[PDB]
Amino acid sequence: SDLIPAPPLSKVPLQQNFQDNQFHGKWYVVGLAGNRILRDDQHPMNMYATIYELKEDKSYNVTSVISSHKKCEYTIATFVPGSQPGEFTLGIKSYSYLVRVVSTDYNQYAVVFFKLAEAEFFAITIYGRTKELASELKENFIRFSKSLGLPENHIVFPVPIDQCIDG
Numbered sequence: 001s002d003l004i005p006a007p008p009l010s011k012v013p014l015q016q017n018f019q020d021n022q023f024h025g026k027w028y029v030v031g032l033a034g035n036r037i038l039r040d041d042q043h044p045m046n047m048y049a050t051i052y053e054l055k056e057d058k059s060y061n062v063t064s065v066i067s068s069h070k071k072c073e074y075t076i077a078t079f080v081p082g083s084q085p086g087e088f089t090l091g092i093k094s095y096s097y098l099v100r101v102v103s104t105d106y107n108q109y110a111v112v113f114f115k116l117a118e119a120e121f122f123a124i125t126i127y128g129r130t131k132e133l134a135s136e137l138k139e140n141f142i143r144f145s146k147s148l149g150l151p152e153n154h155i156v157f158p159v160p161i162d163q164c165i166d167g
Helices: 135-147
Strands: 025-034 049-054 060-068 071-081 087-090 097-104 109-116 121-128
Touching: 025 109, 025 135, 109 135, 121 135
Parallel strands: none
Antiparallel strands: 025 049, 025 121, 049 060, 060 071, 071 087, 087 097, 097 109, 109 121
């Protein structure tokens, strides 16, 4: 009932001149924020990875690699190009899961916005090509998250782990 509402899209910047063939590859989830995310230091979240492999039709095969129970879990989703370069939708379509790459330098970090309208939520991740990022980037990430209505207890920085995410 106090669930923070998804911000209007006009508040979520789009990385201009988005280069799909430079955003591809592996990204580590260094920071994660969302209206369903609740920080709990007694139960830190383990870092996981997401791999974006550009397909021939300009869509992405998106693989998430997560560690749980001493095993490595792999899940896949297809991100289909949206209304603008840098925007994507989850996969059918009956005439609402939205993905927007907000900002990235392609070889260090990437901030990505996710929105699922109807189960509902919005989240923001800051990816890193490695498991760590400069404090300034993370602080900028916290500010962007707040600016979207997410207070600090709705932001977590997954703990870097070595099992399953280094491929």
